Enzyme design. Structure first.
Site, PDB file in Angstrom:
ATOM      1  N   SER A 148       0.825  -1.204   0.000  1.00  0.00           N
ATOM      2  CA  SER A 148       0.000   0.000   0.000  1.00  0.00           C
ATOM      3  C   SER A 148       0.861   1.258   0.000  1.00  0.00           C
ATOM      4  O   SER A 148       0.552   2.228  -0.702  1.00  0.00           O
ATOM      5  CB  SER A 148      -0.946  -0.008   1.201  1.00  0.00           C
ATOM      6  OG  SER A 148      -1.805  -1.137   1.178  1.00  0.00           O
ATOM      7  N   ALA A 202      -4.621  -0.597  -2.426  1.00  0.00           N
ATOM      8  CA  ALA A 202      -3.982   0.005  -1.265  1.00  0.00           C
ATOM      9  C   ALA A 202      -5.015   0.255  -0.176  1.00  0.00           C
ATOM     10  O   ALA A 202      -6.119   0.737  -0.450  1.00  0.00           O
ATOM     11  CB  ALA A 202      -3.288   1.317  -1.636  1.00  0.00           C
ATOM     12  N   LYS A 203      -4.653  -0.081   1.062  1.00  0.00           N
ATOM     13  CA  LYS A 203      -5.515   0.170   2.216  1.00  0.00           C
ATOM     14  C   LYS A 203      -5.142   1.537   2.781  1.00  0.00           C
ATOM     15  O   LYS A 203      -4.402   1.671   3.758  1.00  0.00           O
ATOM     16  CB  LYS A 203      -5.367  -0.942   3.245  1.00  0.00           C
ATOM     17  CG  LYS A 203      -6.466  -0.981   4.287  1.00  0.00           C
ATOM     18  CD  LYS A 203      -6.339  -2.211   5.169  1.00  0.00           C
ATOM     19  CE  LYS A 203      -7.435  -2.246   6.221  1.00  0.00           C
ATOM     20  NZ  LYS A 203      -7.301  -3.420   7.128  1.00  0.00           N
ATOM     21  N   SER A 204      -5.662   2.576   2.135  1.00  0.00           N
ATOM     22  CA  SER A 204      -5.266   3.943   2.440  1.00  0.00           C
ATOM     23  C   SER A 204      -6.230   4.593   3.424  1.00  0.00           C
ATOM     24  O   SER A 204      -7.419   4.269   3.468  1.00  0.00           O
ATOM     25  CB  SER A 204      -5.179   4.781   1.162  1.00  0.00           C
ATOM     26  OG  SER A 204      -6.396   4.751   0.440  1.00  0.00           O
TER      27      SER A 204
END
Lengths: 300, 300, 299, 295, 301, 301
Positions: free
Chosen positions: A65, A152-154
Site C-alpha cells: 500500500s 492500497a488500504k489507504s
C-alpha cells in the site's frame, strides 16, 4: 473514555514510547490530506500462547500500500514484523487488535510529497457471529479503480466506507453492501462478502473490492474442505436468492448475513456452509488445530 | 525545517494554544480514516490593514462541508469568524494563509462515528503568476459525485489530488488537469479551470469539481468587466484550441496556463482576458480597488 | 385471440375456464409491471407428455418473486403440481407453459402494502432451426444490473426486449443482439447467445438472465466433449466466430447465420450447433434415458 | 377493500362500463410484458365548477408516450380529452385523480397483431424524510425516459419500498452518472440563496407539474436554473421539495439524515405551494387555459 | 524514408518496385481509416529465414477484414505465399512484414459500396538495452478504445490514433511507453503491446476484452504453460501493476520487453525479473529456431 | 469509374500536380495509422462568381485539428486559403466539394521523423431527400468518447465509426444513422449535426461529444437572425420521436429534413415549417441570393 488515554506502549518511529506520549502535531499532513496507509491485524490467544494471524501477509500489504502511494517506509519488512510482535508483547496482551499505520509527518502543508517525513506507528490493544446481521445496500457507490487505489488500504479512502456504514445504521441495519461503479456487488463497508447457492460458494472477483486477507484465508479453507468456489460478478438480486451469505474481515472474522434489503437469506439463520467455514476459521486463528502453523506468529 | 516547530499560536477548541502544543494523539480518527473537513483562506495587506478575503464564504462552506459529513461543529459561525481573525492577528501576520480544519478526535477506532468528539483547529502562517504554468492531463480520474461528496472540502478526498499533482510534476509539468468519470475537463488538482475562446469565458459546470470561492469571485469580476461567461461541459481538446486558459484558487489566485499536454494555449502566454482578470482579482484582494469591501474583513 | 380459447387456466388454486380467467382493468401489475413469470415447455416422450426441468422453473419463479418481495401464497410442490395440471387437464401432447405471479386490484399506489398476490398458469400448444436467422445488434442498451433486477424474470422488464425485437424486425432481421451498458454482448431479445471459435464454445458471463436452457447446454457441451468458456464477448468477436446460436425455452436452439450483415462462418448452421441442437431435442424428447429427473411426466 | 369492487363508471374503449365489469383477460399482453402508457391527471373544485388541470398537456403527453412505444391509440386527442371529462362528470366527483391508461390486449403472447385498449378511471405536511435510493434511476437508452410507461415503475416501487423500510417517506433517485434525478414518482427542486435549482431534464420525467412551477417561479420573480445536482448539494440547500400531479408540492426537511435548512417548510416552498394551489383551484382568473370545466 | 529505397512490394497479386508501390492521394482508407493491417516478423533460423506464426497473422488479417465487411480478393493460401514472397524476393535475413488491406480511390463517400479492395505486403530488414534492463512506463491519460465504439478485435488502421496520442504523451513525460486503461479504469494494454505482470510466481494478464488478442500474447500463454507457470486472465488495476514483482510487454515488434517502472513506482527490483527472463529466452529460442518445437510457427521463406 | 483516373489538378505540397499524378507511397503513415486531419468545404455558384462558403472557418478548424493532434502543417493559413481557391479555380469548377487533407508521409513506420504533407482536391458536386425527408435509424454503434478520440478535431481514422454506423443504417433500410454518446444521449448523425423542433423552439445537442459543425454554427446564427429560440441541452432518443420537426446539418448535407426515426413518424412526416425557413435561409446564404455575410463567401476567381 478515550482511545488516547490508556496504559501501555506504542511502537513509534523505531522506539517504544508510552501510550499517551504517542502524539503528532495538529498540522500533520496525513491528518489534513488523507495520504497514508494502514493495516488491521489481530492477535489471538492460542494453546501455544498469543499468536498473530498471518503477520507476514499484513506487513507485505502495508509495504504494498505504501509503495502504491510512493511512501518510503524507513524500515524493512523484518523490522515491521518484529515491531508488530513487539506491539503486542510489550503490552502483555493475551489477544489484541493491531493498527500498523504509515503516515506523512507535519513537515509541510502543500500537496507535494517532497519534504514530508514518513512516520510509522503500531498500536495494539485488547449474536452477530451467531444468528446473522441485517444488511442494506449502500446508496453510495464503492470506489472506482481509477479514482482511488483499490489495492492500497489507504487512510483517506475510508470516508466512503464511513458514509455507507452510517447510512446502513440509520436505516435500521448492521452493515452496508457496496456496489461497484458498474452496479455489481463488491464488498461490505469493511468486509468481503460471500454467498452460497446449492452448496457452491460465490464471491465477487477482486476488481474494485479490497483483496482481503480473511477472504484469501477462506478461499484456502474452502479448497481444503472440498468446497467448490467460484469468483464472478454478483448482482444484488443474486444475493437475495442465495442459500447463505456472510462477511469476512480481520475484525469481523466470519459474520453470517441473514437479511439483505429486507430479503430473507435462505432460512434466515446461519447456514451449514457458513457455520463450517466460520468454525474452521476460528479454530485456525485460535490455534485449536495444528493446521497452518505458518499463519500463526507467536508474540513472545 | 518543520511545520510543527513554530513560534505562534493556533486556535484549538476555543483556546489559543501555543503552536508546538497544538497536538493530537496518533490514534486520531480523522488521521486514520480521513473523515474531516477543512478550508483554505488567505489574508492580504490592504490600505486599511491586514484583511481576510471573503471570510464569510469560507466559514459558511466549512459548515456546509461539516453538514455534508454529519459532523457537528460545536461552535457558531460567528465564533469561527472571530477565531479565524484571531489566528491572523495574534500571530502578527501582515499576509497569511489560514487553515481551519474540523476533525474527529481520538475517541474510537471503529468506522462508526458515534462517540467521536469534534475538534476545531485554525492555524495561520505567512514567477508562475506572471509567466504561466505547464499542465498535463492527469491519468487519474477525478472524484465521482456518488463515491465522494464533491461539494464538501473533505480531508481524505485529497489523495486523488496528490496522486495527480505528483504525476504532473514527474512528467515535467507544474499542474494536472483533472477529467471527470465521463472524460470531460473538471478542474486542476487544487484549482478550478477556465478557458477563453473568441472573448467568451468558459468553465466546467460545478459537477465533479469543487465550487471554488475564487471561481465564484472570478464570475463576479468577469461580469463587472463585460465578459460573457458560459458554464458548460469542456473536453480536453477544446482546451487545446482555446485562446486563453487559467486556474483559480485561494492559493493559486489567478494562474495562467500557457501549455497543456504539449499543446500551446493560444500564444503560449498570459492572454489579454486572463491578465485583466488577474489584475482585477489582485486589486480586489489587496484593497487596491474600492468596491466589495464586504469581502475584506479587518483582522485587528 | 389469446383469450378466446378452449381449455382451463390454473387460477389461484382452481382450474377455471379459459375465458373466465379475467382480472380487473385496474390490476396493479397491469399498471406498474411488478410481477414475475416463467416460460416452461412440455414435450412428448416415449413415456408420455413430460415437462422439461419443472423443478428448475418453479424454483426460479419463487426466486424471482423473492427478489421482488412478492409472497407466493403456495408452496413449490403446489406450483409444481399446478403446472402439471395445466398441461394434463388441457389434454396437451406438447405445450408451452406460462406461470405468472402478479399483484391484484386492491390498490393503485406505488406501495405494495395491501396488494393480494395472484398466481395463474396457462398452457397451450422450421427453416430457422436448420438455416439460421439474421441478427441485428440492438441500438437499445440491455438492462443495468442496478436499475432492474436482471436475475428476476419480471413482467415490466420486457419493454426493453420488445423495443429491440421490433427494431431488428423493421431492419430486415429476425432477432436482436443486446449489448450491456459497458458495450459487451449480453443476450438476444429473449434468449442467451453462444459462439463457437476453433472448436471452443464461448458465452457471456452471467446483465443477462441465468437461463435454464443455457445451463442445460453447459451440461450437454461437457457430455459431448466440448470446451466451454464463460467470458465477456464483443460484437466483433461474434462477427468472426465459426458458429453462433441462441438458446431459450421457446426457441430451444436457433442457429445464427448473420450478425450485422457479417456472415457467421459458412452462413449456415455449424457442426457444434448441430450436435448440441440434436442433443437438446433428444434430451427433452426422452430419446435418451439420461437426465430422467429433468423430464417430469404430466400423467 | 379493493380497487375493483367500486361504484361508478370507467371509460373503456369508447363506452362507459360499470366499475366492477371493467375487466380484462389474465393473459393481457401489457400485464405480462409491461408495454403500456398512462397518465396521472387531477380535477379540482373551482368557483366555475370542477375543472381538470392542464387536460391538454396530459392528453398530448399520453399520445407522445404511446408514439414513443409505437402504440397507435384508436382515438383522437379530442376524444380522449372529452372522455377524460366524462370520467369525472359521470362519476359525480367534485375532485378526482384521473388515470388514463393505454395497453395491449390479450390477442397474442409473443414479443412482436395486438389490439390497443384505452381506459380512463376516475376516483376521489411540514416536510417528509427522504433517503437516497441504492437503486439507480432509469438509463436514457435502456428505457424511454420521456414516455410514462407502465413497466418502468418497477424501479420506483423498489426505491420507495427501500426508503420506507429504512424509516423514511420517499426516495431520491440518482442517474447512472450519480447525479440527482428525481424522487420516487415526483420531480425534485432545491433552493439556495433565493435561487431555485432543479435537475436538468436528463433522465427526468418532463413533469407537467414541474413545467407549471417554472411558470409560477418566473411570475413570482424567482430565478430558476436547470443543471446537474449532486446529492450533497441537496444536503446544504436552504429548501427542497417534490412536485407531482398527486403530490402537488411536498416539502423535504431531511435527506439521508441531513437536516434541510431549518428542517421545516421554507419560504420559497410555501409561496410556490400556495401559488400552485391557487392556480389549480381557480382562486384567480390567471391561466384559465389550464383549467377545463368538467360539466 | 520508407518509400525511396530498393526492393519489391507485393501489390495486388504482382511484385512491383518499392518506389512504384504507390496509391492515389484520394485513397479512401487514407482519408477515413477504414482498413486492416498486420505486423509480422521473420527471423534467422538454422533452416534459414523463417516467418514466425505466418498462419495466425494471415487468419487474423482475414478476421479483421471480415469485421469491417472488407472482402480480400485473395485466399489465405495466396496471402501466405505473398508474405513469403515479400521476404524472399527482397533477400532479407530477418525482417518486419506489413500486410495491409485497404480501400482504393474509387469513391469519396462514407459508403463502402463501390470501393475496390487492395492488398499490400511490404517487408524490410530489422533497442536492445531496453530488452534486458526494462523500460519506463507512464499510464496514459487517454482512455483505451471502447468495445462498442471501435471494433477492438480487428487490427484496424484508423484505430491507432489513440495509440499514437498515448505514446506521444508518455514520451513527453519522460517514459518509453504508455499503459492504457479501458473505459472502466482497468489495465488493458500498452500503446501497441499486451501487458503481463508477475506476483508471487503467478502470471497475470488482462482478459481479452478491451485489448487486442495479440499473437505474441497467445504465444507467451503457451510458453508459460510449457514452463509450468500458472497464468490467470483477470481484470487488473493500475496499482496492482505497481506492486507486481515483474512486468513486461508482449508484441510482434516488441518481442518481450520488460517493464522496470510504472508511474514512478519501481517494479520489483527495477530490472528484468526471473520469470520474464525465462519467457523472454523461451520466446527468442522459439522464433529463431534454437528450439525444434513448434515447426508450424516457423514457415521457411 | 474511379476517383483517381480523372482530369484536372490537385494542390500537392505547394504545387499543382496532375490529378492522376497526385499519388503517395503505399507505406504512407496516415494510410496505416489514420493519424491525419481533413476538412469538407463547399464552393457554390453565386451571382458574384464561384465562392467558397466560410473558407476561413474551415481553414481555422483544419489548423485546430492539426494542433490537437500535434501535427505541424508546413504551410500557413493564408497559403491554405489560397490553395483551396486554386483547387477550385484551376479545375474550372462552377461548384465543388473541397477536401483539404493533412497527413504524415512515408518516412517512418513506428507509432518522430515523419514529414507532414498537405493535399487539396476539388471535384464537382440526393435532391428528393432534400425537400421530403430521409429515414433515420438509431445506430447500435456508440459515438466517439471525449477522452478516447479528440471529438473537436476532424481526424481521418476517427471516421471508421461513422462508416460502421452509416452502413448499418443503410442495411436496415434507412438513409442515415443517429448516433448516441457513451451516456445514451443523442449526439449527431453519422456526419451531420442534428436539430429538433418542438412547439416552435429549436433544440440541438450541446457541443459535448458531437462535432462542433460549421454548418451547425451557421444555423445558430441564422436561427437567431430569424427570431427563433434555440436551446442547447441533452436530448434523448425518444425526445426526437415526439418532436415536431427534425433535420441534419453538414457541409455536404446542408439542411436535410428528417421525416422518420426508428420507424417513428416525425410530426407530420414531411418537411416542417421551421426546417423549410432555415433550409431556405441556408441555401440563400451559401448561393449568394442574399448579400448578407459577405465575409462568408470568398470568391474563387
Amino acid at each position: 473514555m478515550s482511545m488516547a488515554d490508556r496504559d501501555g506502549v506504542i511502537w513509534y518511529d523505531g522506539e517504544l514510547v508510552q501510550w499517551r506520549d504517542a502524539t503528532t502535531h495538529v498540522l500533520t499532513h496525513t491528518h489534513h490530506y488523507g495520504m497514508g496507509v494502514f493495516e488491521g491485524v489481530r492477535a489471538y490467544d492460542t494453546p501455544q500462547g498469543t499468536a498473530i494471524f498471518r503477520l507476514q501477509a499484513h506487513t507485505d500489504r502495508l509495504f504494498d500500500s505504501a509503495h502504491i502511494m510512493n511512501m518510503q517506509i524507513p524500515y524493512s519488512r523484518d523490522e515491521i514484523n518484529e515491531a508488530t510482535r513487539a506491539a503486542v508483547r510489550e503490552n502483555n496482551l493475551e489477544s489484541a487488535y493491531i493498527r500498523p499505520m504509515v503516515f506523512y509527518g507535519s513537515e509541510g502543508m502543500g500537496l507535494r510529497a517532497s519534504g514530508l517525513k514518513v512516520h510509522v506507528i503500531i498500536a495494539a490493544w485488547s449474536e452477530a457471529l451467531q444468528q446473522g446481521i441485517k444488511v442494506r445496500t449502500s446508496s453510495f457507490t464503492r470506489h472506482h479503480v481509477n479514482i482511488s487505489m483499490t489495492r492500497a488500504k489507504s487512510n483517506g479512502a475510508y470516508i466512503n466506507s464511513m458514509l455507507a456504514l452510517q447510512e446502513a445504521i440509520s436505516g435500521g441495519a448492521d452493515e452496508a453492501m457496496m456496489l461497484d461503479p458498474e452496479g455489481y456487488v463488491a464488498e461490505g463497508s469493511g468486509e468481503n462478502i460471500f454467498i452460497i447457492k446449492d452448496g457452491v460458494i460465490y464471491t465477487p472477483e477482486v476488481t474494485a473490492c479490497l483483496n482481503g486477507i480473511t477472504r484469501n484465508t477462506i478461499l484456502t479453507l474452502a479448497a481444503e474442505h472440498g468446497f467448490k468456489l467460484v469468483e464472478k460478478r454478483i448482482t444484488r438480486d443474486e444475493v437475495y436468492i442465495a442459500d447463505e451469505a456472510f462477511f469476512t474481515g480481520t475484525a469481523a472474522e466470519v459474520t453470517p448475513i441473514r437479511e439483505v434489503d429486507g430479503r430473507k437469506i435462505g432460512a434466515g439463520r446461519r447456514g451449514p456452509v457458513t457455520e463450517k467455514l466460520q468454525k474452521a476459521y476460528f479454530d485456525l486463528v485460535s490455534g485449536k488445530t495444528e493446521a497452518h502453523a505458518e499463519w500463526r506468529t507467536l508474540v513472545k
